[PDB]
Amino acid sequence: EFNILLATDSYKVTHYKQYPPNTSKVYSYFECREKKYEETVFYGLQYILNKYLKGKVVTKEKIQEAKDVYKEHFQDDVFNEKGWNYILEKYDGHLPIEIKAVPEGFVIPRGNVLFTVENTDPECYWLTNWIETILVQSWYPITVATNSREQKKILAKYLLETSGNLDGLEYKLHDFGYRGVSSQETAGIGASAHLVNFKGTDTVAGLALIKKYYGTKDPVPGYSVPAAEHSTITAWGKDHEKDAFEHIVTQFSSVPVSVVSDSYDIYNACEKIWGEDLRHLIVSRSTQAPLIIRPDSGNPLDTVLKVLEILGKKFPVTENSKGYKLLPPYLRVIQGDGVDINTLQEIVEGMKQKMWSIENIAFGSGGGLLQKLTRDLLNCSFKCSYVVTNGLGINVFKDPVADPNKRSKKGRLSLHRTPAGNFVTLEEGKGDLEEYGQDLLHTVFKNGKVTKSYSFDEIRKNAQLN
Amino acid sequence: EFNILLATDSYKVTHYKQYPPNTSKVYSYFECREKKYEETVFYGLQYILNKYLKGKVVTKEKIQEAKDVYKEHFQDDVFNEKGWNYILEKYDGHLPIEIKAVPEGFVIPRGNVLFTVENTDPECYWLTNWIETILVQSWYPITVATNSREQKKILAKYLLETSGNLDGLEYKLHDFGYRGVSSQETAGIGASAHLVNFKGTDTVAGLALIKKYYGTKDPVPGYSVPAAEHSTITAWGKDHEKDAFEHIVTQFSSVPVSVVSDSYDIYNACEKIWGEDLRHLIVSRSTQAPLIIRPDSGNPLDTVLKVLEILGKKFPVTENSKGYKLLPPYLRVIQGDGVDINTLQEIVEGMKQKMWSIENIAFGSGGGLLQKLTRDLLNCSFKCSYVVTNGLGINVFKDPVADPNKRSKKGRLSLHRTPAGNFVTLEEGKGDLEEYGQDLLHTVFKNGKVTKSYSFDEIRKNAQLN
Ligand SMILES: O=P(O)(O)OC[C@H]1O[C@H](OP(=O)(O)OP(=O)(O)O)[C@H](O)[C@@H]1O
Ligand SMILES: O=P(O)(O)OC[C@H]1O[C@H](OP(=O)(O)OP(=O)(O)O)[C@H](O)[C@@H]1O
Numbered sequence: 001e002f003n004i005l006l007a008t009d010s011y012k013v014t015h016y017k018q019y020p021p022n023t024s025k026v027y028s029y030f031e032c033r034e035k036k037y038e039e040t041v042f043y044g045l046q047y048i049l050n051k052y053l054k055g056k057v058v059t060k061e062k063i064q065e066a067k068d069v070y071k072e073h074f075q076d077d078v079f080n081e082k083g084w085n086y087i088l089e090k091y092d093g094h095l096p097i098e099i100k101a102v103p104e105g106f107v108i109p110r111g112n113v114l115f116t117v118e119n120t121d122p123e124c125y126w127l128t129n130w131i132e133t134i135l136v137q138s139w140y141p142i143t144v145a146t147n148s149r150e151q152k153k154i155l156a157k158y159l160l161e162t163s164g165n166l167d168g169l170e171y172k173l174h175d176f177g178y179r180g181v182s183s184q185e186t187a188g189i190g191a192s193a194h195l196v197n198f199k200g201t202d203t204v205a206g207l208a209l210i211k212k213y214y215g216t217k218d219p220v221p222g223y224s225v226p227a228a229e230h231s232t233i234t235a236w237g238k239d240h241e242k243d244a245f246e247h248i249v250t251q252f253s254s255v256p257v258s259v260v261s262d263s264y265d266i267y268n269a270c271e272k273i274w275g276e277d278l279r280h281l282i283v284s285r286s287t288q289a290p291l292i293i294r295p296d297s298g299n300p301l302d303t304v305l306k307v308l309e310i311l312g313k314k315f316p317v318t319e320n321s322k323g324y325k326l327l328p329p330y331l332r333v334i335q336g337d338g339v340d341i342n343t344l345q346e347i348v349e350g351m352k353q354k355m356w357s358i359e360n361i362a363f364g365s366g367g368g369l370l371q372k373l374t375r376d377l378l379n380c381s382f383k384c385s386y387v388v389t390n391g392l393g394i395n396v397f398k399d400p401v402a403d404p405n406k407r408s409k410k411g412r413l414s415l416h417r418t419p420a421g422n423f424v425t426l427e428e429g430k431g432d433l434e435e436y437g438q439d440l441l442h443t444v445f446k447n448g449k450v451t452k453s454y455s456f457d458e459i460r461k462n463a464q465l466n
Numbered sequence: 467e468f469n470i471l472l473a474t475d476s477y478k479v480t481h482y483k484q485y486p487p488n489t490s491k492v493y494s495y496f497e498c499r500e501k502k503y504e505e506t507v508f509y510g511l512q513y514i515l516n517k518y519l520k521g522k523v524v525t526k527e528k529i530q531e532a533k534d535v536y537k538e539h540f541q542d543d544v545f546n547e548k549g550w551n552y553i554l555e556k557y558d559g560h561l562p563i564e565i566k567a568v569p570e571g572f573v574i575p576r577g578n579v580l581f582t583v584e585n586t587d588p589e590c591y592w593l594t595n596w597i598e599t600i601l602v603q604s605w606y607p608i609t610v611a612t613n614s615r616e617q618k619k620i621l622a623k624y625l626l627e628t629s630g631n632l633d634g635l636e637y638k639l640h641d642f643g644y645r646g647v648s649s650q651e652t653a654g655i656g657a658s659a660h661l662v663n664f665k666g667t668d669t670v671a672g673l674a675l676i677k678k679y680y681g682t683k684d685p686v687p688g689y690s691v692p693a694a695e696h697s698t699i700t701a702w703g704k705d706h707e708k709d710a711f712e713h714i715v716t717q718f719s720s721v722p723v724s725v726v727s728d729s730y731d732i733y734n735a736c737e738k739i740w741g742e743d744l745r746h747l748i749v750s751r752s753t754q755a756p757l758i759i760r761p762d763s764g765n766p767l768d769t770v771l772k773v774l775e776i777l778g779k780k781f782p783v784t785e786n787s788k789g790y791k792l793l794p795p796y797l798r799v800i801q802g803d804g805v806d807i808n809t810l811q812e813i814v815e816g817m818k819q820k821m822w823s824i825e826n827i828a829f830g831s832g833g834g835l836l837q838k839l840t841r842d843l844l845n846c847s848f849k850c851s852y853v854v855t856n857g858l859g860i861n862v863f864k865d866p867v868a869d870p871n872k873r874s875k876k877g878r879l880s881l882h883r884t885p886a887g888n889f890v891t892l893e894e895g896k897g898d899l900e901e902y903g904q905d906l907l908h909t910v911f912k913n914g915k916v917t918k919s920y921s922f923d924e925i926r927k928n929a930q931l932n
Contacts, residue, residue, distance in 0.1 A: 002650070006670045006671065006673075006674065007650065007670070007671065008644075008670065009642075009644050009645065009668040009669070009670075010667070010668040010669075010670055010690035011668055011690065011691075011692060011693035011694075011695065011724070012695070014692035014693070014718070015694075015695065015697075015698050017692075017714075017717045017718075018694055018698035018710075018713070018714050018717065019697075019698055019701050020701055020702050020706075020709075020710075020713075023701065026697065026701065028697065052650075069670070069673060069674075069686065072684075072685040072686040073670070073673065073686050073688070073689055073690055074689070074690060074691070074692070074721075075689065075721075076721055078692060129695070129697050132645065133644050133645045134650075136645040136646075137645060137647070137648070137649065137650070139645075139646075140647075140648040140649070176475070178474075178475050178599050179475065179598065179599045179602040179603060179605075179841070179848075180602075180605070180840065180841045181603070181606075181648070182603070182606040182647070182648055182649070182652040182655065182656065182837075183603065183606070183648070183649055183651040183652040183655055184468070184473065184518075184600075184603070184651060185649040185650060185651035185652065186648040186649040186651065186652050189648065189649055190648065201476070202475040202476040202477055203475070203476075204472045204473070204474065204475075204476055204535070204539070205472070205473065207472075207535060207539065208472065208535075219538040220535070220538040220539055222539070223539060223540070223541070224476035224477065224539060224540060225477075225540070226477060226480035226540070226544065227477035227480070228477075228484060229477065229478070229481070229595070230849065230850070230864045230874075231481075231492070231494065231595050231849070231850035231862075232481050232484035232485060234850060234862045234863060234864050235485055235486060235489065235492065235850060235853045235855070235860075235862055236486050237860055237862070238863075240486075243486075244484075244486075247484070247486075248484050251483050251484065252480070252483075255540075255542060258477070262866045262867075262868075263864045263865075263866065264864070264865055264866070264867065265866075265867045266866065266867065266868065267867065268867075296866070297866040297868050297869040297872050298866070298867075298868030298869055299868075303868065366841075367840045367841055367842060371648075371840050371841070372840050374646065374833040374837050374838050375645070375646045375832075375833055375837070376833060382645075383696065383697070384696070384697035384700060384701060387701045389701070394701075394703055396697075396700045396701055396703065397700060397704075398696045398700050398729045398730070399729070399730055400728045400729070400730070400731075400732065400762070400763035400764070401728075401730065401731040401732065401733070401734075401763075401764075402728075402732065402763050402764030402765070402769065403763040403764055406763055408696075
């Protein structure tokens with residue numbers, strides 16, 4: 001069972017002895033500090049609130065467990081047993097904390113407050129930053145959701161330019177990241193963050209998380225199709241790639257099927273096997289059930305172009321109203337190797353220059369989508385901005401001399417729409433002047449209860465492209 | 467409840483209809499493919515076997531749950547209900563799988579078999595590659611352990627050169643990665659992997675994982691010390707940094723204490739506050755209770771060197787037996803900002819050139835230690851190498867034309883010691899010839915049971931530096 005007393009950075013166990021005496025309030029905030037990612041999707045907090053923070057999170061046994069561990073960990077009894085016991089006795093183990101957050105799915109420019117944390121009981125001044133560690137981990141679903149949306153922007157731009165519409169955009173970037181992430185829990189979190197923007201996923205874990213923590217009107221938030229891997233092709237033996245190909249497309253004749261084609265020779269597979277030997281099984285396919293040829297090696301741009309070049313000469317290629325080449329509806333290509341935001345841009349641009357419609361191509365991304373991201377990409381940061389000491393509120397901040405970018409905000413914070421319809425974070429409690437509209441930060445957690453939640457449908461709506 | 471039927475890549479649900487008819491055996495292996503990072507620490511499989519793979523992992527409820535999810539996920543009844551029911555009825559939900567692996571903590575050159583997977587029942591040919599996704603996630607603890615060890619190699623080289631010994635090496639790289647990782651589960655896995663090489667950690671989750679899945683003779687595998695953060699300094703107010711400093715060091719006067727000193731001006735804090743105003747509280751401290759000054763901004767190397775020069779002028783610096791400058795034992799520095807394998811090397815080399823002993827410095831790493839790593843850093847891959855179809859064993863492999871590095875191994879595999887005492891992976895069942903010694907892989911999993919285990923003490927011993 002999870003223990004919140006053991007879910008913090010070790011040194012935070014010693015911080016209750018470090019704050020100024022007579023401190024009754026610690027007030028902190030999360031932002032993606034200003035530095036290619038000018039706006040961020042806020043997503044993932046509701047998961048953390050429900051799974052880890054809500055209800056009775058302190059028990060008699062959990063306090064003793066923590067006390068025993070930290071005694072050995074520090075070689076000293078520094079642990080605040082008395083502080084945690086107070087929470088157990090007075091609030092039945094419910095956290096006297098208030099969390100206010102911008103609605104999930106909201107797209108917010110960098111350098112704005114996204115959520116705030118404060119203690120609601122003066123005895124628990126130390127608790128605000130105790131939970132920094134668990135809350136800051138929201139950086140990940142935020143960053144995955146943001147990076148995924150930015151890739152959608154690129155896909156949208158090129159799809160619209162090369163085809164004149166956005167049909168099937170929500171299926172142009174497929175999550176292949178399950179094996180390439182660091183854990184089962186990460187897989188589910190990351191997969192769900194991608195599903196804010198897209199509907200194609202192989203990371204099943206993401207579906208259960210959305211169902212449990214967010215909810216959607218549809219039975220499932222994400223979908224997939226039958227697909228081959230190298231084991232299902234190579235198990236037939238090198239001399240029998242054609243038989244493997246034939247068997248798989250015949251098995252999945254009435255649904256879309258993706259078939260990895262680079263086991264031995266991708267260019268041979270497209271020209272000779274797909275383009276000649278088994279052509280008759282491809283041209284007879286439905287528009288609802290295309291063959292999706294999947295290269296999986298070589299230079300991503302060069303390989304996609306060569307594959308399209310080969311297929312264009314073996315199958316009846318048309319030219320759409322924008323003047324771009326289009327494969328027949330029963331045949332498509334998915335690039336699922338070496339795909340990240342940079343190579344995605346590189347491929348669609350190379351395709352456009354060679355006059356190929358983005359209709360022809362879909363993308364798959366694993367590590368690039370769910371793993372090759374850090375807390376530093378969006379400068380995700382949690383800092384104390386306000387304390388009450390001796391009954392007086394003081395605006396607090398860091399401002400390192402050698403890095404002005406690390407300067408933090410002062411005082412009590414609020415988020416507002418500007419008259420031109422942008423966003424502004426007001427500092428030093430200036431939001432109380434009512435010069436702007438309503439504070440966009442809403443109480444989502446208070447004293448052990450989740451007070452406002454959003455469905456996954458609402459989140460998708462909020463995170464739409466312009 | 468974790469459901470193994472929902473813990474695979476979506477397309478693997480469709481693979482039982484893709485293998486050649488009358489396939490009785492699927493045999494696959496894991497390696498870190500060849501072409502820094504020339505050898506890998508094998509760590510983390512035991513965790514996966516115990517948490518996810520062992521015992522009764524199939525129930526009737528879990529089969530129905532998966533059936534209903536995949537029905538909506540594929541918009542089709544492609545899920546292998548009968549295959550999974552067979553396992554439940556015949557084996558009481560235990561996986562008919564055998565896994566052979568190198569001992570954990572073992573240091574193996576790239577391009578060698580690390581573990582193999584095969585089905586023990588002909589009916590369950592499809593199960594071998596079903597569990598690929600779960601098992602491939604071992605890339606992460608392997609990569610953390612390996613990258614951590616490579617950093618220890620760098621630290622050892624410079625500590626030995628500047629001081630003449632390796633005292634306290636195991637405390638020179640501290641885990642700060644809790645908030646910087648993608649999930650709670652990743653935090654535990656990654657922290658445990660770092661603890662294979664070092665003993666300092668702030669990521670508490672790592673302790674419980676080790677004690678549950680590996681075990682150590684000591685009460686805890688990892689330790690920490692009291693330390694300040696920006697909130698516990700800045701809360702005092704801009705004009706009261708000295709008061710913050712004084713309070714914290716006097717509260718923790720008998721243990722080591724780390725104090726972040728860059729809230730407003732790092733060079734002012736070192737020269738005027740530590741070096742003048744509070745010098746009397748530093749020079750009185752025990753050798754077992756040093757002040758550890760923590761810069762946290764600016765250029766990592768330039769800041770460390772400037773901090774050291776400042777302290778050198780305010781404090782009684784000595785010269786060690788190797789001719790390098792050494793701060794008094796009550797005074798140390800920790801650089802915990804922007805630390806990864808590359809910048810660690812830069813700092814210790816830069817220190818050496820300015821004649822500063824590595825005794826003076828410790829490092830902390832967060833994202834660089836536990837997050838900024840991917841599956842392709844060590845080329846971690848899981849591939850089928852051998853199948854039995856129509857009673858005949860067939861050597862299986864991929865060899866893509868445009869990437870010869872992606873070529874996989876053929877047939878039944880075994881790991882051996884060479885006459886010169888190195889490692890060799892023999893292919894095509896050639897290990898049966900016994901021209902080398904016995905196969906060095908052990909059966910670690912068979913038919914739902916963990917059959918071989920290693921304590922965390924064994925692993926640490928296996929993974930030590932030469
Ligand atoms: O973007 P990524 O994180 O790489 O994930 C996508 C890739 O992962 C799989 O490769 P596989 O597991 O066979 O690894 P390998 O290609 O390195 O052998 C799959 O064949 C995709 O090409
Ligand atoms: O190696 P990393 O992943 O950066 O983690 C380590 C850093 O994290 C903490 O800063 P904080 O959480 O305040 O982040 P910030 O300095 O970017 O605000 C700490 O002060 C370290 O500098």
